[PDB]
Design an enzyme around this catalytic site. Structure first.
Site, short mmCIF file in Angstrom:
data_model
loop_
_atom_site.label_atom_id
_atom_site.label_comp_id
_atom_site.label_asym_id
_atom_site.label_seq_id
_atom_site.Cartn_x
_atom_site.Cartn_y
_atom_site.Cartn_z
N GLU A 203 0.82 -1.21 0.00
CA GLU A 203 0.00 0.00 0.00
C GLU A 203 0.85 1.27 0.00
OE1 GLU A 203 -3.61 -0.29 -0.07
OE2 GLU A 203 -2.84 -2.24 -0.69
N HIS B 113 -16.24 -11.36 -10.65
CA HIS B 113 -15.96 -10.44 -11.75
C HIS B 113 -16.79 -10.73 -12.99
CE1 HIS B 113 -12.48 -10.48 -9.07
NE2 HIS B 113 -12.21 -9.25 -9.48
ZN LIG Z 1 -2.33 -3.42 -4.37
#
Ligand SMILES: [Zn+2]
Ligand SMILES: *[C@@H]1O[C@H](CO)[C@@H](O[C@@H]2O[C@H](CO)[C@@H](O[C@@H]3O[C@H](CO)[C@@H](O)[C@H](O)[C@@H]3O)[C@H](O)[C@H]2NC(C)=O)[C@H](O)[C@H]1NC(C)=O
Ligand SMILES: *[C@@H]1O[C@H](CO)[C@@H](O[C@@H]2O[C@H](CO)[C@@H](O[C@@H]3O[C@H](CO)[C@@H](O)[C@H](O)[C@@H]3O)[C@H](O)[C@H]2NC(C)=O)[C@H](O)[C@H]1NC(C)=O
Ligand SMILES: *[C@@H]1O[C@H](CO)[C@@H](O[C@@H]2O[C@H](CO)[C@@H](O)[C@H](O)[C@H]2NC(C)=O)[C@H](O)[C@H]1NC(C)=O
Ligand SMILES: *[C@@H]1O[C@H](CO)[C@@H](O[C@@H]2O[C@H](CO)[C@@H](O)[C@H](O)[C@H]2NC(C)=O)[C@H](O)[C@H]1NC(C)=O
Ligand SMILES: *[C@@H]1O[C@H](CO)[C@@H](O)[C@H](O)[C@H]1NC(C)=O
Ligand SMILES: *[C@@H]1O[C@H](CO)[C@@H](O)[C@H](O)[C@H]1NC(C)=O
Lengths: 596, 96
Positions: free
Chosen positions: A357, A487
């Site tokens: 992150e 998805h």
């Molecule tokens: Zn990521």
């Protein structure tokens, strides 16, 4: 008046309005995500309505300038992005039906539950129930029962809606002067214009085919090893020469093979690396993890974190007083506001997610100077790839040993390396055929090559030809298997993952070679290298202002996707697989079926 | 110098405006307060709406912006050392 000047002034107005509107929307979304309250939901709905209305209105004023009179190569991309009819091509009833069917599909997938037969008071939900059964159970009949059930109740109830969804999507795609909706997704990789850097929409299919045609032998050897290893857990349920049934793969759909590490471990006597004990003995908290990540990133010459980042971002869950959704996320609210949201506990996995992150945040901070419409990745694959290269670099034993988290006399042997390579392989290499097959099937359906009454006859053959998996029970036209995926039920592309997997290893090899590494690739650290930092930064700060081919050339040096690093990263694993399976059967045949 | 503590609001200190558009250049030490609608095309200009724009756009100060968006108060003391009359006053340190 000089039309280009008028277009430029319109862009100037749009840039200043959109910044404030988007900031308000992002701040409302952040506040809602931290807490849980009904009036917060109302405020988020109002803010999203305002943002959408502003965007729709500003789109209309941009249609006055035809695109053909522009000689700038920079405002052209912004105007092309803004001049696109979002959903105005369709009629009002068409939009109503499309939104109805999309929301209906999302709700149907969201609230799926299954009840065990003859037990009306015993029902399980998908995520709360079937995931645990698939991921941590060694039984046989129960897995088959769940695999048959979930598909039986879901596909037959979702196929007819998907038919109309496909019809309407194709209608809209033809309305927007495209070929088909698969072309609409393929258009994201399209770059037209500058000479020497053209990339047509149709070239991606050929590139994917050619690139996948090379890793197949490695997948073949790995699959043979897996089939050989599975003979100890399922002695009387695995075909000696057939394909692996899909109901014993440790997942509902077979996306990853990670759950097989403890069953196919090469040398199980020595355990793997886990640094928890030293972390506990020094009383580690989230602050130390994040500052270590900051030190690692600044070691290569990249900037630090903003002063406000340490103040406005929460690092641990507050507790029962509040109620948030624990899912790691890096937020780009704009105007110098960057925050990280993650519920942290002292474990190696979170220690790696922190690096992932923070690399995401650095990529966001790189391209803050570009205009608003240009502030994104080069394409839909660079973002997680830049995230993951740091994670790959930071978890090698050499880096842990150097930073004092491990014993200074820690003797690294050549015995754990095979285990590490197999653990990485079972989650990186074993997923490419699945993605390739699903995208191939979806594009063939959108183009229409597969008649409606012959879907399964090609779907189940593609499985045998690519993934090497065979269905355990016969199925008729009632079933709609692919729709069960997250998805697939929701409108989302799937070809991002293949590009990310190919790009990350290319980036890693380039940085390691420019970083003066000695030895095989798997023991490389990108630390201590301005040579590998300036090279990456020359790609980070461009944003979407240049074609992605040129951005790639500034790092890799070649302007096309390459596959050599993916095979290079697994040289000793390939050698060991070649040595081990000399006395076994190579390849899979479609002859054995459990029902016949 | 930074002025976050006295020039920001949660809803927004929408009290500062700045010029964005002009069909001309400026000259040193000039002040303009014109609020006439700005023309962008050949056609006659009638209010806001189409290409005609109001040549004034506002800031969006908020307390949680980054350093590059927070207000700095700039007082340009352009004393040209040539004020002749009354110029040359002198602190004139004095001793015992
Ligand atoms: Zn990521
Ligand atoms: C496409 O259009 C854009 C927008 O008009 C052009 O951007 C402009 O590029 C020039 C450099 O080629 C910039 O010039 C420099 O500006 C700085 C101040 O920012 C000044 O100190 C320098 O002396 C120089 O004048 C210019 O600012 C920039 N304009 C904007 C609004 O970004 C771009 O060059 C055009 N591209 C092509 C290929 O012509
Ligand atoms: C970005 O991160 C670096 C590394 O953490 C920061 O470097 C800091 O640099 C100052 C100045 O050298 C250090 O302070 C002290 O400097 C004197 C010499 O002037 C030295 O005798 C002291 O022992 C001490 O090193 C500071 O410790 C150092 N690190 C930290 C944690 O701040 C840099 O300031 C950061 N800057 C930005 C833009 O975020
Ligand atoms: C969607 O975009 C197209 C762009 O081709 C718009 O097409 C126009 O259609 C009208 C009516 O046929 C013509 O007067 C225009 O000249 C066309 N424009 C161009 C550039 O071809 C279409 O109107 C848009 N649909 C919307 C905004 O609802
Ligand atoms: C890689 O980075 C580490 C970061 O600490 C470097 O370590 C320092 O190296 C100097 C070399 O003289 C030592 O004096 C320090 O004590 C080291 N700090 C430590 C170990 O925390 C390391 O040298 C770098 N790699 C290379 C090959 O130079
Ligand atoms: C979240 O809720 C708590 C309690 O309901 C409140 O104290 C806090 O201020 C809220 N967060 C924000 C950003 O307002
Ligand atoms: C390590 O190297 C030695 C070299 O002889 C080799 O025999 C051994 O198989 C290698 N790997 C392991 C797991 O020890």
């Amino acid at each position: 008046s000089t039309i280009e000047e008028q277009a430029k002034t319109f862009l100037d107005k749009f840039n200043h309005e959109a910044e404030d509107l988007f900031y308000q929307s992002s701040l409302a979304s952040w506040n809602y995500n931290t807490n849980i309250t009904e009036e917060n939901v109302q405020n988020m709905n109002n803010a999203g309505d305002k943002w959408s209305a502003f965007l729709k209105e500003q789109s209309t004023l941009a249609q006055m300038y035809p695109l053909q009179e522009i000689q700038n190569l920079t405002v052209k991309l912004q105007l092309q992005a803004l001049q696109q009819n979002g959903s105005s091509v369709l009629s009002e009833d068409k939009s109503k039906r499309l939104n109805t069917i999309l929301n209906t599909m999302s709700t149907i997938y969201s609230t799926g539950k299954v009840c065990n037969p003859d037990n009306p008071q015993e029902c399980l939900l998908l995520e709360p129930g079937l995931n645990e059964i698939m991921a941590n159970s060694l039984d046989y009949n129960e897995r088959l029962w769940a695999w048959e059930s979930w598909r039986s109740e879901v596909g037959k109830q979702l196929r007819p809606l998907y038919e109309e969804y496909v019809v309407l999507k194709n209608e809209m795609a033809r309305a927007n002067h495209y070929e088909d909706y698969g072309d609409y997704w393929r258009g994201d990789y399209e770059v037209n214009g500058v000479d020497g850097y053209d990339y047509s929409r149709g070239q991606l299919i050929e590139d994917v085919e050619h690139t996948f045609e090379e890793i197949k032998p490695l997948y073949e050897h790995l699959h043979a090893y897996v089939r050989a290893k599975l003979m100890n857990a399922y002695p009387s349920y695995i075909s000696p020469i057939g394909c692996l049934p899909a109901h014993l793969l440790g997942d509902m759909w077979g996306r990853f093979w990670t759950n097989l590490y403890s069953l196919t471990v090469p040398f199980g006597q020595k355990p793997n690396i886990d640094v928890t004990d030293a972390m506990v003995d020094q009383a580690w908290d989230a602050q130390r993890i994040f500052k270590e990540a900051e030190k690692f990133f600044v070691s290569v010459g990249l900037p630090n974190m903003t002063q406000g980042f340490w103040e406005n971002s929460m690092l641990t869950d507050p507790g029962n007083v509040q109620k948030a959704v624990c899912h790691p996320t890096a937020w780009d609210l704009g105007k110098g506001d960057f925050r990280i949201l993650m519920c942290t506990k002292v474990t190696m996995d979170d220690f790696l997610t922190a690096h992932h992150e923070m690399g995401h945040i650095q990529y966001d901070m790189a391209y803050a100077a570009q205009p608003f419409l240009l502030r994104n990745g080069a394409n839909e694959g660079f973002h997680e790839a830049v995230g993951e290269i740091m994670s790959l670099s930071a978890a090698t034993p050499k880096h842990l040993k150097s930073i004092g988290l491990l014993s200074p006399d820690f003797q690294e042997d050549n015995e754990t390396e095979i285990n590490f390579l197999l653990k990485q392989a079972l989650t990186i290499v074993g997923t490419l055929p699945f993605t390739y097959m699903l995208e191939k099937w979806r594009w063939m359906v959108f183009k229409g090559e597969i008649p409606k009454d012959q879907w399964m006859k090609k779907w189940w053959e593609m499985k045998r030809e690519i993934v090497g998996v065979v269905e355990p029970v016969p199925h008729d036209e009632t079933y709609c298997d692919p729709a069960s995926l997250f998805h697939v039920s929701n409108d989302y592309s799937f070809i991002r993952y293949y590009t990310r997997t190919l790009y990350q290893f290319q980036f890693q090899e380039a940085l390691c070679q420019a970083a003066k590494h000695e030895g095989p690739l798997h023991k490389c650290d990108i630390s201590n290298s301005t040579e590998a930092g300036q090279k990456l930064f020359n790609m980070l700060r461009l944003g979407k202002s240049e074609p992605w081919t040129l951005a790639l050339e500034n790092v890799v040096g070649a302007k096309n996707m390459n596959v050599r690093p993916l095979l290079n990263y697994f040289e000793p694993l390939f050698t060991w697989l070649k040595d081990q399976n000399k006395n076994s059967f190579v390849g899979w045949s479609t002859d054995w079926s459990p029902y016949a | 110098w930074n002025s976050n503590k006295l020039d920001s609001k949660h809803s927004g200190n929408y009290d500062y405006w700045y010029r964005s558009f002009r069909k001309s250049k400026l000259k040193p030490f000039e002040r303009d307060i014109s609020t006439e609608i700005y023309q962008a095309g050949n056609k006659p200009c009638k209010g806001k709406g189409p290409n005609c724009y109001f040549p004034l756009q506002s800031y969006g100060f908020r307390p949680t912006y980054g350093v590059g968006h927070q207000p700095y108060r700039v007082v340009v003391l352009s004393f040209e050392l040539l004020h002749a009359p009354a110029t040359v006053c002198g602190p004139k340190k004095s001793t015992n």
